[PDB]
Amino acid sequence: AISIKTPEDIEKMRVAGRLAAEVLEMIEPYVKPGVSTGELDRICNDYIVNEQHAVSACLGYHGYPKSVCISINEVVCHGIPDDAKLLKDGDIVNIDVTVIKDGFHGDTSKMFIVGKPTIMGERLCRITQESLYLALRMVKPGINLREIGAAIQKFVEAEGFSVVREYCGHGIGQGFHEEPQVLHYDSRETNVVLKPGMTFTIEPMVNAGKKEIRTMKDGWTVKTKDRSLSAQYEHTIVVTDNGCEILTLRKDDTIPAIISHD
Ligand SMILES: CSCC[C@H](N)P(=O)(O)O
Ligand SMILES: [Co+2]
Ligand SMILES: [Co+2]
Ligand code: NA
């Protein structure tokens, strides 16, 4: 079932959350044309282990071979870092990090634009982030998760894009992927009322083209069926008494860390 975090649990999540956020802040300068994704993965891993004294939740999870997930352009999610995959001007890339500290998980991701952005690329990233922010602003006790997925969907579709159905947000804590499943679209199947102390991620994947996706033979990599660009952003949050707190907020986020309702 859905686990409710204690205040002590929450304090541990703030640390793990901030650690994950920090890897993203740190890597930025390395994201440039000509760098390989395998190299970004090594830099991230070194930092996590050697400086942070933490651990990557990804390494070995169901056999996942690397420390972070790096998805370029049409890759939806779960792209596997590789020494052979070099970044080019105009690429949009997602770096998804999940760190474990004192047994608690922190899961977050953001898009990076390599070199000179393309119009589509910039637009897609922006809209994707806005859709995540919109959802964040709605979080509060008593509301049904269904409403959030529906708002994201309506927003995204209104902008001419599509939302991926298959992958979604999830509870997180001592476990990497806990209940509940956080859908990024409107579904009659969803019936979950939020309560304070719940911790979960929101991580909408938006496609410039059609919603359909396909899983690669590697068993992890996900791509759009039509090869259109896909973007994603992710934050880990905790439901509070009058709103929410964003555990993985970064210096470049433009949303406040604590959102209060009244
Ligand atoms: C190789 S497991 C990686 C899982 C991602 N952090 P997420 O739970 O955001 O999809
Ligand atoms: Co993630
Ligand atoms: Co996640
Ligand atoms: Na992508």
Side-chain angles (χ1 to χ4, degrees), residues 34-84:
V35 302
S36 72
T37 58
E39 283 174 273
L40 294 171
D41 176 79
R42 289 188 281 277
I43 294 167
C44 290
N45 186 251
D46 298 349
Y47 192 74
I48 290 162
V49 170
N50 301 322
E51 303 269 3
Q52 297 186 327
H53 305 282
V55 141
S56 150
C58 303
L59 189 38
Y61 185 76
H62 297 277
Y64 187 85
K66 298 293 181 172
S67 286
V68 299
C69 297
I70 297 173
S71 321
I72 300 160
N73 293 334
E74 81 284 340
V75 177
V76 178
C77 59
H78 305 167
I80 300 179
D82 177 328
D83 285 342

Short mmCIF file of all heavy atoms in Angstrom, two decimals, residues 34-84:
data_model
loop_
_atom_site.label_atom_id
_atom_site.label_comp_id
_atom_site.label_asym_id
_atom_site.label_seq_id
_atom_site.Cartn_x
_atom_site.Cartn_y
_atom_site.Cartn_z
N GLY A 34 30.22 17.10 -28.60
CA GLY A 34 31.43 16.29 -28.60
C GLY A 34 31.61 15.47 -27.33
O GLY A 34 32.48 14.60 -27.29
N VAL A 35 30.83 15.71 -26.28
CA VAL A 35 31.03 14.86 -25.11
C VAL A 35 30.19 13.60 -25.31
O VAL A 35 29.11 13.64 -25.96
CB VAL A 35 30.61 15.50 -23.79
CG1 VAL A 35 31.38 16.78 -23.61
CG2 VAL A 35 29.14 15.85 -23.91
N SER A 36 30.65 12.45 -24.80
CA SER A 36 29.83 11.26 -24.99
C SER A 36 28.87 11.07 -23.80
O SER A 36 29.13 11.61 -22.73
CB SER A 36 30.72 10.03 -25.14
OG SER A 36 31.27 9.75 -23.86
N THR A 37 27.80 10.31 -23.95
CA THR A 37 26.94 10.11 -22.79
C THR A 37 27.61 9.22 -21.72
O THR A 37 27.33 9.34 -20.51
CB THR A 37 25.59 9.54 -23.19
OG1 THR A 37 25.78 8.30 -23.87
CG2 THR A 37 24.85 10.57 -24.04
N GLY A 38 28.52 8.33 -22.18
CA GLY A 38 29.28 7.43 -21.29
C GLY A 38 30.15 8.26 -20.36
O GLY A 38 30.33 7.99 -19.16
N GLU A 39 30.71 9.34 -20.90
CA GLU A 39 31.52 10.21 -20.06
C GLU A 39 30.69 10.95 -19.01
O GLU A 39 31.14 11.13 -17.88
CB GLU A 39 32.25 11.28 -20.89
CG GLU A 39 33.45 10.70 -21.60
CD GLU A 39 33.98 11.78 -22.48
OE1 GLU A 39 33.57 11.96 -23.61
OE2 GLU A 39 34.81 12.58 -21.85
N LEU A 40 29.49 11.41 -19.40
CA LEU A 40 28.65 12.12 -18.44
C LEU A 40 28.26 11.19 -17.29
O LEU A 40 28.21 11.58 -16.14
CB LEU A 40 27.41 12.67 -19.11
CG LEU A 40 27.77 13.75 -20.11
CD1 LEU A 40 26.54 14.12 -20.92
CD2 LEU A 40 28.36 14.98 -19.41
N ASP A 41 28.02 9.93 -17.65
CA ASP A 41 27.66 8.92 -16.67
C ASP A 41 28.80 8.71 -15.67
O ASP A 41 28.58 8.63 -14.45
CB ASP A 41 27.26 7.62 -17.36
CG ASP A 41 26.99 6.51 -16.38
OD1 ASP A 41 25.95 6.42 -15.77
OD2 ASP A 41 27.96 5.63 -16.27
N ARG A 42 30.03 8.60 -16.18
CA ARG A 42 31.17 8.42 -15.28
C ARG A 42 31.37 9.61 -14.36
O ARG A 42 31.65 9.48 -13.18
CB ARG A 42 32.47 8.19 -16.05
CG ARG A 42 32.53 6.84 -16.73
CD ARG A 42 33.90 6.58 -17.32
NE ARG A 42 34.10 7.27 -18.59
CZ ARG A 42 33.65 6.77 -19.74
NH1 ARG A 42 33.02 5.60 -19.70
NH2 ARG A 42 33.82 7.41 -20.90
N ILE A 43 31.23 10.82 -14.91
CA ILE A 43 31.37 11.98 -14.06
C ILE A 43 30.32 11.95 -12.96
O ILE A 43 30.61 12.17 -11.78
CB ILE A 43 31.28 13.27 -14.89
CG1 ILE A 43 32.47 13.35 -15.83
CG2 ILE A 43 31.29 14.50 -13.99
CD1 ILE A 43 32.25 14.44 -16.87
N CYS A 44 29.08 11.66 -13.34
CA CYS A 44 28.02 11.63 -12.34
C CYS A 44 28.30 10.62 -11.25
O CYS A 44 28.16 10.92 -10.06
CB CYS A 44 26.63 11.35 -12.92
SG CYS A 44 26.01 12.71 -13.90
N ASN A 45 28.68 9.42 -11.66
CA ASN A 45 28.97 8.33 -10.74
C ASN A 45 30.10 8.64 -9.75
O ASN A 45 30.05 8.35 -8.57
CB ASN A 45 29.29 7.04 -11.50
CG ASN A 45 29.43 5.93 -10.49
OD1 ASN A 45 30.54 5.43 -10.24
ND2 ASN A 45 28.32 5.65 -9.82
N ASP A 46 31.15 9.26 -10.26
CA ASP A 46 32.28 9.62 -9.42
C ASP A 46 31.87 10.57 -8.34
O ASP A 46 32.27 10.47 -7.18
CB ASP A 46 33.45 10.22 -10.24
CG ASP A 46 34.00 9.24 -11.25
OD1 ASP A 46 33.68 8.06 -11.25
OD2 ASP A 46 34.81 9.79 -12.13
N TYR A 47 31.07 11.53 -8.75
CA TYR A 47 30.59 12.56 -7.84
C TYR A 47 29.75 11.96 -6.71
O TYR A 47 29.97 12.20 -5.54
CB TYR A 47 29.78 13.58 -8.66
CG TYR A 47 29.49 14.81 -7.88
CD1 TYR A 47 30.50 15.75 -7.63
CD2 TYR A 47 28.21 15.02 -7.34
CE1 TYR A 47 30.26 16.91 -6.88
CE2 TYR A 47 27.96 16.17 -6.58
CZ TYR A 47 28.98 17.11 -6.36
OH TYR A 47 28.71 18.23 -5.63
N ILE A 48 28.78 11.16 -7.12
CA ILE A 48 27.87 10.49 -6.19
C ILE A 48 28.62 9.68 -5.15
O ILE A 48 28.43 9.80 -3.96
CB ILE A 48 26.82 9.63 -6.95
CG1 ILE A 48 25.81 10.53 -7.70
CG2 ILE A 48 26.02 8.79 -5.96
CD1 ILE A 48 25.05 9.78 -8.78
N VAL A 49 29.52 8.85 -5.63
CA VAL A 49 30.27 7.97 -4.76
C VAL A 49 31.39 8.62 -3.99
O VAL A 49 31.54 8.43 -2.79
CB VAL A 49 30.88 6.82 -5.54
CG1 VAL A 49 31.86 6.07 -4.66
CG2 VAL A 49 29.80 5.88 -6.09
N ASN A 50 32.20 9.36 -4.70
CA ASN A 50 33.36 9.95 -4.09
C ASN A 50 33.16 11.25 -3.37
O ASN A 50 33.84 11.54 -2.38
CB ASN A 50 34.55 10.05 -5.07
CG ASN A 50 34.95 8.69 -5.62
OD1 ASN A 50 34.93 7.69 -4.89
ND2 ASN A 50 35.25 8.64 -6.91
N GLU A 51 32.29 12.07 -3.85
CA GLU A 51 32.12 13.31 -3.13
C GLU A 51 30.94 13.24 -2.22
O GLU A 51 30.98 13.54 -1.04
CB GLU A 51 31.94 14.48 -4.14
CG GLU A 51 33.11 14.56 -5.12
CD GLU A 51 34.21 15.46 -4.63
OE1 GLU A 51 34.19 16.00 -3.53
OE2 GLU A 51 35.18 15.61 -5.51
N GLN A 52 29.84 12.82 -2.77
CA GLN A 52 28.67 12.76 -1.93
C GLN A 52 28.68 11.62 -0.96
O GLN A 52 27.91 11.61 0.00
CB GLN A 52 27.39 12.66 -2.78
CG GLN A 52 27.22 13.90 -3.67
CD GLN A 52 25.90 13.85 -4.39
OE1 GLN A 52 25.41 12.79 -4.75
NE2 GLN A 52 25.28 14.99 -4.57
N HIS A 53 29.46 10.59 -1.22
CA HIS A 53 29.40 9.45 -0.31
C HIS A 53 28.01 8.82 -0.28
O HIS A 53 27.53 8.32 0.73
CB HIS A 53 29.94 9.75 1.10
CG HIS A 53 31.33 10.28 1.03
ND1 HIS A 53 32.42 9.43 0.81
CD2 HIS A 53 31.79 11.56 1.08
CE1 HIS A 53 33.49 10.21 0.75
NE2 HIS A 53 33.16 11.49 0.90
N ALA A 54 27.39 8.83 -1.44
CA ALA A 54 26.09 8.23 -1.60
C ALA A 54 26.17 7.08 -2.61
O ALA A 54 27.23 6.57 -2.94
CB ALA A 54 25.02 9.26 -1.97
N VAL A 55 25.03 6.66 -3.12
CA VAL A 55 25.03 5.58 -4.06
C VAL A 55 23.99 5.81 -5.15
O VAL A 55 22.96 6.42 -4.87
CB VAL A 55 24.76 4.37 -3.15
CG1 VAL A 55 23.83 3.33 -3.74
CG2 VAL A 55 26.10 3.76 -2.79
N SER A 56 24.23 5.34 -6.38
CA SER A 56 23.24 5.50 -7.43
C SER A 56 22.24 4.39 -7.30
O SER A 56 22.64 3.24 -7.20
CB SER A 56 23.85 5.35 -8.83
OG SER A 56 22.87 4.83 -9.73
N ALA A 57 20.95 4.71 -7.36
CA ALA A 57 19.94 3.68 -7.23
C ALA A 57 19.81 2.87 -8.48
O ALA A 57 19.19 1.80 -8.46
CB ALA A 57 18.56 4.21 -6.83
N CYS A 58 20.36 3.40 -9.56
CA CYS A 58 20.19 2.74 -10.86
C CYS A 58 21.07 1.53 -11.13
O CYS A 58 20.64 0.57 -11.75
CB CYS A 58 20.29 3.77 -12.04
SG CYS A 58 19.10 5.14 -11.93
N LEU A 59 22.31 1.65 -10.69
CA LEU A 59 23.34 0.67 -10.93
C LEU A 59 22.94 -0.70 -10.41
O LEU A 59 22.84 -0.91 -9.20
CB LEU A 59 24.62 1.25 -10.32
CG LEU A 59 25.88 0.46 -10.66
CD1 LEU A 59 25.81 -0.05 -12.10
CD2 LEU A 59 27.09 1.36 -10.47
N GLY A 60 22.62 -1.63 -11.31
CA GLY A 60 22.23 -2.96 -10.90
C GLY A 60 20.73 -3.18 -10.68
O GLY A 60 20.30 -4.31 -10.46
N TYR A 61 19.94 -2.11 -10.73
CA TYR A 61 18.48 -2.21 -10.53
C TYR A 61 17.89 -3.01 -11.67
O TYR A 61 17.95 -2.62 -12.83
CB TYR A 61 17.93 -0.78 -10.48
CG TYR A 61 16.47 -0.73 -10.15
CD1 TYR A 61 16.04 -0.95 -8.85
CD2 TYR A 61 15.51 -0.43 -11.12
CE1 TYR A 61 14.69 -0.87 -8.49
CE2 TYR A 61 14.16 -0.35 -10.78
CZ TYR A 61 13.74 -0.58 -9.47
OH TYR A 61 12.41 -0.49 -9.10
N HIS A 62 17.34 -4.19 -11.38
CA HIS A 62 16.84 -5.06 -12.44
C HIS A 62 17.94 -5.30 -13.49
O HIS A 62 17.65 -5.57 -14.66
CB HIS A 62 15.52 -4.58 -13.13
CG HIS A 62 14.40 -4.54 -12.15
ND1 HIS A 62 13.68 -5.67 -11.84
CD2 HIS A 62 13.94 -3.52 -11.40
CE1 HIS A 62 12.80 -5.31 -10.92
NE2 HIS A 62 12.94 -4.02 -10.63
N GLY A 63 19.21 -5.17 -13.10
CA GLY A 63 20.28 -5.38 -14.06
C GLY A 63 20.74 -4.13 -14.82
O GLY A 63 21.68 -4.18 -15.61
N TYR A 64 20.12 -2.99 -14.57
CA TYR A 64 20.55 -1.76 -15.25
C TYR A 64 22.05 -1.59 -15.03
O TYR A 64 22.57 -1.61 -13.89
CB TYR A 64 19.72 -0.53 -14.80
CG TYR A 64 20.02 0.71 -15.62
CD1 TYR A 64 19.36 0.93 -16.82
CD2 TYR A 64 20.95 1.66 -15.17
CE1 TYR A 64 19.63 2.06 -17.60
CE2 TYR A 64 21.23 2.80 -15.93
CZ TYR A 64 20.57 2.98 -17.14
OH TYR A 64 20.81 4.10 -17.89
N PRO A 65 22.76 -1.46 -16.14
CA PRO A 65 24.21 -1.42 -16.11
C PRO A 65 24.93 -0.12 -15.79
O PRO A 65 26.14 -0.15 -15.62
CB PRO A 65 24.61 -1.83 -17.53
CG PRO A 65 23.49 -1.31 -18.40
CD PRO A 65 22.24 -1.26 -17.52
N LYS A 66 24.24 1.01 -15.76
CA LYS A 66 24.92 2.29 -15.55
C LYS A 66 24.41 3.03 -14.32
O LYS A 66 23.52 2.58 -13.63
CB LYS A 66 24.75 3.20 -16.77
CG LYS A 66 25.36 2.63 -18.03
CD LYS A 66 26.87 2.61 -17.85
CE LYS A 66 27.64 2.08 -19.03
NZ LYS A 66 29.10 2.29 -18.84
N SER A 67 24.97 4.21 -14.08
CA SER A 67 24.59 4.96 -12.90
C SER A 67 23.44 5.94 -13.05
O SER A 67 22.80 6.24 -12.05
CB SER A 67 25.77 5.69 -12.30
OG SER A 67 26.56 4.72 -11.66
N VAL A 68 23.25 6.48 -14.24
CA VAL A 68 22.20 7.45 -14.53
C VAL A 68 21.57 7.06 -15.87
O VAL A 68 22.08 6.18 -16.61
CB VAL A 68 22.74 8.92 -14.57
CG1 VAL A 68 23.37 9.40 -13.24
CG2 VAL A 68 23.80 9.10 -15.65
N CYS A 69 20.46 7.70 -16.20
CA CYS A 69 19.82 7.47 -17.49
C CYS A 69 19.96 8.75 -18.28
O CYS A 69 19.65 9.84 -17.79
CB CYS A 69 18.33 7.18 -17.39
SG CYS A 69 17.98 5.66 -16.48
N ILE A 70 20.39 8.61 -19.53
CA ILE A 70 20.57 9.79 -20.38
C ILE A 70 19.80 9.57 -21.67
O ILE A 70 20.15 8.68 -22.42
CB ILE A 70 22.05 10.05 -20.64
CG1 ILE A 70 22.74 10.36 -19.30
CG2 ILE A 70 22.17 11.29 -21.54
CD1 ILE A 70 24.27 10.48 -19.37
N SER A 71 18.76 10.35 -21.91
CA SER A 71 17.95 10.15 -23.08
C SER A 71 18.05 11.33 -24.04
O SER A 71 17.64 12.41 -23.70
CB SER A 71 16.48 9.90 -22.71
OG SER A 71 16.43 9.08 -21.54
N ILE A 72 18.53 11.06 -25.26
CA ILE A 72 18.68 12.08 -26.25
C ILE A 72 17.57 12.10 -27.28
O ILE A 72 17.19 11.04 -27.77
CB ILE A 72 20.00 11.87 -26.98
CG1 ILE A 72 21.17 11.94 -26.02
CG2 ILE A 72 20.22 12.97 -28.01
CD1 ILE A 72 22.39 11.27 -26.62
N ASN A 73 17.08 13.31 -27.58
CA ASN A 73 16.10 13.58 -28.63
C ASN A 73 14.85 12.70 -28.59
O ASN A 73 13.99 12.86 -27.72
CB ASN A 73 16.78 13.49 -30.02
CG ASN A 73 17.80 14.61 -30.24
OD1 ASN A 73 17.70 15.68 -29.64
ND2 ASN A 73 18.85 14.36 -31.02
N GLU A 74 14.74 11.79 -29.55
CA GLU A 74 13.60 10.88 -29.66
C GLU A 74 13.57 9.79 -28.55
O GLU A 74 12.58 9.09 -28.33
CB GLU A 74 13.43 10.31 -31.07
CG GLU A 74 14.35 9.13 -31.42
CD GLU A 74 15.77 9.51 -31.70
OE1 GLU A 74 15.95 10.77 -32.02
OE2 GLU A 74 16.67 8.70 -31.65
N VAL A 75 14.65 9.63 -27.80
CA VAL A 75 14.60 8.68 -26.71
C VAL A 75 13.71 9.31 -25.65
O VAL A 75 13.97 10.44 -25.21
CB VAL A 75 15.95 8.44 -26.07
CG1 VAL A 75 15.77 7.48 -24.88
CG2 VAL A 75 16.90 7.85 -27.09
N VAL A 76 12.68 8.55 -25.26
CA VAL A 76 11.68 8.96 -24.27
C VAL A 76 12.22 8.98 -22.86
O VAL A 76 12.13 10.01 -22.16
CB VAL A 76 10.38 8.15 -24.37
CG1 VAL A 76 9.35 8.56 -23.28
CG2 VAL A 76 9.79 8.35 -25.76
N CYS A 77 12.72 7.81 -22.47
CA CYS A 77 13.29 7.66 -21.15
C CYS A 77 14.16 6.45 -21.12
O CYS A 77 14.13 5.63 -22.04
CB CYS A 77 12.19 7.49 -20.09
SG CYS A 77 11.11 6.05 -20.38
N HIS A 78 14.90 6.34 -20.02
CA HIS A 78 15.75 5.19 -19.77
C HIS A 78 16.89 4.95 -20.73
O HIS A 78 17.35 3.81 -20.78
CB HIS A 78 14.92 3.90 -19.57
CG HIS A 78 13.95 4.18 -18.48
ND1 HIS A 78 12.88 3.35 -18.19
CD2 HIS A 78 13.93 5.23 -17.60
CE1 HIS A 78 12.24 3.91 -17.15
NE2 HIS A 78 12.83 5.05 -16.79
N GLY A 79 17.33 6.02 -21.43
CA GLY A 79 18.44 5.84 -22.36
C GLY A 79 19.69 5.41 -21.57
O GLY A 79 20.03 5.93 -20.52
N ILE A 80 20.41 4.44 -22.11
CA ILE A 80 21.62 3.94 -21.48
C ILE A 80 22.87 4.68 -21.92
O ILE A 80 23.16 4.75 -23.11
CB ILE A 80 21.77 2.47 -21.86
CG1 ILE A 80 20.56 1.69 -21.36
CG2 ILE A 80 23.03 1.89 -21.22
CD1 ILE A 80 20.65 0.22 -21.71
N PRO A 81 23.63 5.25 -20.96
CA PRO A 81 24.83 5.97 -21.36
C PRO A 81 25.77 5.08 -22.19
O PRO A 81 25.85 3.88 -21.99
CB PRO A 81 25.49 6.45 -20.07
CG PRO A 81 24.37 6.49 -19.03
CD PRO A 81 23.28 5.56 -19.52
N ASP A 82 26.52 5.66 -23.11
CA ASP A 82 27.38 4.87 -23.95
C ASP A 82 28.51 5.74 -24.43
O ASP A 82 28.28 6.90 -24.81
CB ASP A 82 26.49 4.42 -25.14
CG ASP A 82 27.12 3.61 -26.25
OD1 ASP A 82 28.28 3.73 -26.59
OD2 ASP A 82 26.28 2.79 -26.83
N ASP A 83 29.72 5.18 -24.42
CA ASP A 83 30.93 5.88 -24.85
C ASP A 83 30.89 6.32 -26.31
O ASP A 83 31.53 7.28 -26.69
CB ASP A 83 32.21 5.05 -24.56
CG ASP A 83 32.59 5.05 -23.11
OD1 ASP A 83 32.16 5.86 -22.31
OD2 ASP A 83 33.40 4.07 -22.78
N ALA A 84 30.11 5.61 -27.10
CA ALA A 84 29.93 5.85 -28.52
C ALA A 84 28.93 6.93 -28.89
O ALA A 84 28.97 7.44 -30.02
CB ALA A 84 29.49 4.54 -29.18
#
